[PDB]
Amino acid sequence: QLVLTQSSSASFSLGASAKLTCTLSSQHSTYTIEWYQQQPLKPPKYVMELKKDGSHSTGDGIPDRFSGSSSGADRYLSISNIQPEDEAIYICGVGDTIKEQFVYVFGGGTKVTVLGQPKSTPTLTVFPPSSEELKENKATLVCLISNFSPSGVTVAWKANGTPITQGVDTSNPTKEGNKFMASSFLHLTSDQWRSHNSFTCQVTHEGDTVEKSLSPA
Amino acid sequence: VQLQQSGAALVRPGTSVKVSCRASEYAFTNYVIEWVKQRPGQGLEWIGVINPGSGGTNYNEKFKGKATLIADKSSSTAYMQLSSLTSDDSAVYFCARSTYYSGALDYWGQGTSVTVSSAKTTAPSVYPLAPVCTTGSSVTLGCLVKGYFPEPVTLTWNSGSLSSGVHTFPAVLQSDLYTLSSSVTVTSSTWPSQSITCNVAHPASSTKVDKKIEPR
C-alpha cells in the first residue's frame, strides 16, 4: 500500500504556469519521489528527485522552467511558461524496502495537453495501385498524411461520390518533429479500381477537410 | 552512458522469452538494473531489480514466478526471462540504471518490443510506386510494403545512401498483417537516370527486398 495518486490528464494554456500533483499514501507522507517524463516511442526521461521539504535534484537535459515543491503527502512538478515540447505523460515513482524487499512503485501518470497551440493542417500524398500489384487482381490506394497538429484525425475514402467502408485501414498518428503523420490504405480488386472515374482520400482534422483524388484514367 | 537492449522478439503463446540489457560507458556492478513494462495506454509497471554485485533480486509480487533477472559481470549484461507468455505480455520492456543509494532510474534502455502471437510470420510484398500523374524539376517516389508479420521492418532508400527527403509513415494492422508506405522526393536530374531502390528488411522472415522505382 505504497501508492502514488495522480490525475490521469491535465490541460494548460501555452505560456502558463503548470503544477502537477503526485500524492503519497499517508503512511509514506515523508518519502522522497522521482518525476519522469514520457513522450511516445521514446524511453522515459528522469526529470528530478523531490524530497519532503521541497528540495529537488533535476536530471540532465531538463530545462530550468522545471521545478519541484512539497506540502505534506503532496509532491509537485512545476513547469513555468509551458511549451508544446512539454506535452508528455509525467509519472512519479517511489522506492522503499517493505517486508525486507526493495520495491519501486509508479503513479498512473498525468497526460499533459498544452492548449492554445496554432494547428498544422495535413498535406496529402496519394499513390495509385502499381501495375505489378494490379497483375495479381489487387489494388492498394495509398494516402500519406503529413504535418498535422494536434494528432486527432479521421480518414474516409470515396469511390466517385460514395463512401467506401470495406477495405480501409488507417494508422494511429506518430509524432515527427513538432507535428504528426499517419497513413490510410484502401484495398480494392483490380476491377473495382479500373471501373470507377475517381477515388478520394478525405482527412478530417480539427474541423478542416483535406481531400486528394486519383483516377485510373 | 547507455543501456543497449536486445532487438524486437516474436514469442509464441505458452513459451518463454529472454531479453538483454548491456551496460555501456559505465561500471555495470556499481549500479543496480531495474526492469519496467510499458502499460497499454499510459504509465509504467515495475518488474524488479537485480543487484549485480550481490546477485540479489527483488520483484513486484505480480512478476514473482513470471520474471527471472540475471546479471553477467563478465559481459556487463543484465537478462530478463519472462515465462509462459500470453498476449498480455506483448509490450515494450525497458531496463533502467539506479544507484545503490537513491531511487532515481537515471538512464533507460531504448526498449525491447515483445510480440506474443500465434499469427503466421509473413514476409512483405514490396511494390514500387512511380510518380503519380511526372513533369517538373522534382518527383516523389513511393514504396508500398504490404502484409507482413510481425513488426519490425527496416525500410531505407538506396540502403540509407538516400537519406534526404525520405518520409516513412506509420504502419496499419488488420487481421495480423501490417502494411506501410514510404515516399522520397528526388530531383528530375537524379531520377530516373540513377537507380533508386526501396530496401525492406524483415528480420523475422530473414528476407530483404531492394525494389527499383521504374518510370511508366
Binding site: T32, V94, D96, T97, F102 | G56, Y101
Partner: peptide
C-alpha cells in the same frame, strides 16, 4: 522511515 538502499 523510507529505506533508500537496494
Amino acid at each position: 522511515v523510507q529505506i533508500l538502499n537496494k
